[PDB]
Design a protein around this ligand. Structure first.
Ligand code: SF4
Length: 85
């Protein structure tokens, strides 16, 4: 069900980013980045999400910091930045 080009939790990029699909387990609540309450924070409302990304699907879109691979919209990383436009 996850794409082959899913971001791996153990990607070097993901380790650096502290990317996690499991937004409940995610450091987001601990980190409490400014923008919107941690519970709201995920790739879904991240400035850097790329839903245009080739091979994007239901729960699975791109992220600027994760080219070629797809993050899960539900997930979060330390770089999470509030959806502008
Ligand atoms: S930058 Fe945003 S979209 Fe990308 S992985 Fe982090 S939280 Fe998700």
């Amino acid at each position: 069900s996850a794409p082959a080009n899913a971001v791996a939790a153990d990607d070097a990029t993901a380790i650096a980013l502290k990317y996690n699909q499991d937004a409940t387990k995610s450091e987001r609540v601990a980190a409490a980045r400014p923008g919107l309450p941690p519970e709201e924070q995920h790739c879904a409302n991240c400035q850097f999400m790329q839903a245009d990304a080739a091979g994007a699907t239901d729960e699975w879109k791109g992220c600027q910091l994760f080219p070629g691979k797809l993050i899960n919209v539900n997930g979060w990383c330390a770089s999470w930045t509030l959806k502008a436009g």
